[PDB]
Amino acid sequence: SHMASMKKKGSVVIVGRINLSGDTAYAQQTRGEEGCQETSQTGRDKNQVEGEVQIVSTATQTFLATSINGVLWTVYHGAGTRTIASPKGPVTQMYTNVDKDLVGWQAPQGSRSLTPCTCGSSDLYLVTRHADVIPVRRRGDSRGSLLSPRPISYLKGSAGGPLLCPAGHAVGIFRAAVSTRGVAKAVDFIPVESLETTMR
Numbered sequence: 001s002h003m004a005s006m007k008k009k010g011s012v013v014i015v016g017r018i019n020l021s022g023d024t025a026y027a028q029q030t031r032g033e034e035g036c037q038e039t040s041q042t043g044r045d046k047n048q049v050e051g052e053v054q055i056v057s058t059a060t061q062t063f064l065a066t067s068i069n070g071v072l073w074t075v076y077h078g079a080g081t082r083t084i085a086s087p088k089g090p091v092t093q094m095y096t097n098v099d100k101d102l103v104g105w106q107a108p109q110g111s112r113s114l115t116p117c118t119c120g121s122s123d124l125y126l127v128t129r130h131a132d133v134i135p136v137r138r139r140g141d142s143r144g145s146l147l148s149p150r151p152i153s154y155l156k157g158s159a160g161g162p163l164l165c166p167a168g169h170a171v172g173i174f175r176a177a178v179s180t181r182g183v184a185k186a187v188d189f190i191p192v193e194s195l196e197t198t199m200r
């Protein structure tokens with residue numbers, strides 16, 4: 001029948017991480033293609049999570065997700081209303097705000113959260129899905145300009161990753177880049193204060 005053939009969106013699946021806990025930033029893959037697809041449909045992810053920044057996938061996109069204050073956050077435009085796969089099965093979103101382009105799930109067992117920035121610094125660092133650390137000058141609440149031009153393609157799939165202050169604390173969640181002729185000049189991000197307001 002038409003109803004009995006209706007498919008369900010899978011879960012978001014954690015497929016790697018950006019390791020920032022050492023002296024070197026680098027990407028790690030923890031699941032390959034077949035395993036990602038299976039885990040998406042069951043919603044059951046056996047892998048132990050570690051770290052603050054996850055690399056996540058849906059069937060159509062790969063992007064990032066960042067743990068701050070006990071919630072793993074990402075962009076709505078990547079995750080939609082999807083559950084995330086976990087050891088206990090699919091986990092429903094704790095927070096969803098399309099107007100902020102923000103979703104959040106309870107942070108997975110084994111993950112750690114970044115500490116929100118208290119130092120007020122306007123010199124930020126964007127962490128990409130390829131573990132590139134890109135200096136960004138903050139221009140106000142939710143914006144920053146790149147210190148050096150990069151092609152907009154270098155930032156593809158980094159939505160949901162962190163903007164960190166010089167100390168490595170969280171200032172915000174990367175959402176979108178502004179470009180001209182394919183060259184990224186500025187970023188838009190969801191500030192940590194806005195996450196906290198969502199939580200309150």
Ligand SMILES: [Zn+2]
Pocket residue numbers: 117118119120121165166167168169
């Ligand atoms: Zn700071």
